[PDB]
Design an enzyme around this catalytic site. Structure first.
Site, PDB file in Angstrom:
ATOM      1  CG  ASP A 180       3.905   5.020  -8.485  1.00 32.75           C
ATOM      2  OD1 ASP A 180       3.195   5.286  -7.713  1.00 32.75           O
ATOM      3  OD2 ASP A 180       5.191   4.571  -8.055  1.00 32.75           O
ATOM      4  CB  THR A 181       9.227   1.621  -9.598  1.00 35.57           C
ATOM      5  OG1 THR A 181       9.670   2.689  -8.882  1.00 35.57           O
ATOM      6  CG2 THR A 181       9.567   1.786 -10.973  1.00 35.57           C
ATOM      7  N   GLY A 182       6.598   2.236  -7.133  1.00 36.96           N
ATOM      8  CA  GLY A 182       6.278   2.044  -5.947  1.00 36.96           C
ATOM      9  C   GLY A 182       4.930   1.334  -5.838  1.00 36.96           C
TER      10      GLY A 182
HETATM   11  C1  LIG Z   1       6.378  11.954  -1.366  1.00 33.41           C
HETATM   12  C2  LIG Z   1       5.147  11.393  -0.387  1.00 33.41           C
HETATM   13  C3  LIG Z   1       4.534  10.172  -1.052  1.00 33.41           C
HETATM   14  C4  LIG Z   1       5.318   8.892  -0.873  1.00 33.41           C
HETATM   15  C5  LIG Z   1       3.963  10.104  -2.594  1.00 33.41           C
HETATM   16  N1  LIG Z   1       3.556  11.397  -2.771  1.00 33.41           N
HETATM   17  C6  LIG Z   1       3.744  12.338  -3.709  1.00 33.41           C
HETATM   18  C7  LIG Z   1       3.011  13.596  -3.835  1.00 33.41           C
HETATM   19  O1  LIG Z   1       4.720  12.191  -4.501  1.00 33.41           O
HETATM   20  C8  LIG Z   1       3.235   9.046  -2.882  1.00 33.41           C
HETATM   21  O2  LIG Z   1       2.520   8.783  -2.019  1.00 33.41           O
HETATM   22  N2  LIG Z   1       3.309   8.314  -3.862  1.00 33.41           N
HETATM   23  C9  LIG Z   1       2.736   7.225  -4.350  1.00 33.41           C
HETATM   24  C10 LIG Z   1       2.153   7.677  -6.011  1.00 33.41           C
HETATM   25  C11 LIG Z   1       1.143   8.920  -5.614  1.00 33.41           C
HETATM   26  C12 LIG Z   1       1.619  10.230  -5.963  1.00 33.41           C
HETATM   27  C13 LIG Z   1       1.018  11.576  -5.744  1.00 33.41           C
HETATM   28  C14 LIG Z   1      -0.333  11.317  -5.178  1.00 33.41           C
HETATM   29  C15 LIG Z   1      -0.978   9.866  -4.725  1.00 33.41           C
HETATM   30  C16 LIG Z   1      -0.148   8.957  -4.959  1.00 33.41           C
HETATM   31  C17 LIG Z   1       3.316   5.910  -4.462  1.00 33.41           C
HETATM   32  O3  LIG Z   1       4.362   6.171  -5.614  1.00 33.41           O
HETATM   33  C18 LIG Z   1       2.644   4.785  -4.784  1.00 33.41           C
HETATM   34  N3  LIG Z   1       1.946   4.431  -3.342  1.00 33.41           N
HETATM   35  C19 LIG Z   1       2.423   3.235  -2.683  1.00 33.41           C
HETATM   36  C20 LIG Z   1       3.743   3.838  -1.725  1.00 33.41           C
HETATM   37  C21 LIG Z   1       3.289   4.839  -0.681  1.00 33.41           C
HETATM   38  C22 LIG Z   1       4.299   2.586  -1.051  1.00 33.41           C
HETATM   39  S1  LIG Z   1       0.150   4.561  -3.570  1.00 33.41           S
HETATM   40  O4  LIG Z   1      -0.212   5.305  -4.410  1.00 33.41           O
HETATM   41  O5  LIG Z   1      -0.376   4.596  -2.466  1.00 33.41           O
HETATM   42  C23 LIG Z   1      -0.173   3.123  -4.004  1.00 33.41           C
HETATM   43  C24 LIG Z   1      -0.694   1.925  -3.058  1.00 33.41           C
HETATM   44  C25 LIG Z   1      -1.104   0.745  -3.412  1.00 33.41           C
HETATM   45  C26 LIG Z   1      -1.113   0.211  -4.826  1.00 33.41           C
HETATM   46  O6  LIG Z   1      -1.707  -0.954  -5.184  1.00 33.41           O
HETATM   47  C27 LIG Z   1      -1.570  -1.969  -4.099  1.00 33.41           C
HETATM   48  C28 LIG Z   1      -0.793   1.501  -5.676  1.00 33.41           C
HETATM   49  C29 LIG Z   1      -0.471   2.516  -5.390  1.00 33.41           C
END
Ligand SMILES: CC[C@H](C)[C@H](NC(C)=O)C(=O)N[C@@H](Cc1ccccc1)[C@H](O)CN(CC(C)C)S(=O)(=O)c1ccc(OC)cc1
Lengths: 99, 99
Positions: B25-27
């Site tokens: 997860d690059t996000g």
């Molecule tokens: C398409 C809707 C949504 C964007 C996406 N969900 C899905 C189902 O793909 C998601 O929340 N995607 C998440 C990963 C994901 C996937 C499915 C269910 C829950 C989470 C995302 O890639 C990482 N997150 C940080 C982002 C929001 C800036 S994060 O997860 O909120 C996050 C925040 C802070 C972190 O560290 C500081 C690490 C990760």
């Protein structure tokens, strides 16, 4: 380009004629942008992530130029923490993960 | 390897005696794992995404193998719906985005 990950992979996008910064997010199924106006019809949708669900507006078949590469697809608009380019459009621009 | 984004980029990771499936997860700035009772000291943290914030436990210097590549660093543990490999570990395995 090849983009490394020691910083957030933020790139400039062009959508509805405007420039924005957006996060290339391989962990996002969909593309979600911060509140903005886009032309045309939309439908209410809900999407979920780490903290629960939010309401968004779904715009279909929207052109978006991402770091110079053209995509046309579904763009969700709502209370996302940051503009997110998700896999629906990352696939269109030929983006892969490599190690 | 090269991983396309037609589907979620899930890979097998090892942390402890549990092989798990996790999203590359690059996000994600940080790595966030589903609830597991890891040994050792931790610090409380809140992390935020779509839907809001969740409370996690921050463990440092935890060895994790990702697709047979060794990494070691900070892992956040809490009520995430998916195991998330963040940039802090993606950099260590030489992972890039390419298009
Ligand atoms: C398409 C809707 C949504 C964007 C996406 N969900 C899905 C189902 O793909 C998601 O929340 N995607 C998440 C990963 C994901 C996937 C499915 C269910 C829950 C989470 C995302 O890639 C990482 N997150 C940080 C982002 C929001 C800036 S994060 O997860 O909120 C996050 C925040 C802070 C972190 O560290 C500081 C690490 C990760």
């Amino acid at each position: 380009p090849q983009i490394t990950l020691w910083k957030r992979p933020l790139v400039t996008i062009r959508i509805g004629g405007q420039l924005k910064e957006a996060l290339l997010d391989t962990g996002a199924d969909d593309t979600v942008l911060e509140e903005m106006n886009l032309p045309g019809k939309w439908k209410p949708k809900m999407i979920g992530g780490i903290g629960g669900f939010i309401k968004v507006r779904q715009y279909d078949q929207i052109p978006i130029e991402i770091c110079g590469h053209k995509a046309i697809g579904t763009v969700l608009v709502g209370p996302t923490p940051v503009n997110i380019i998700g896999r629906n459009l990352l696939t269109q621009i030929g983006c892969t993960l490599n190690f």
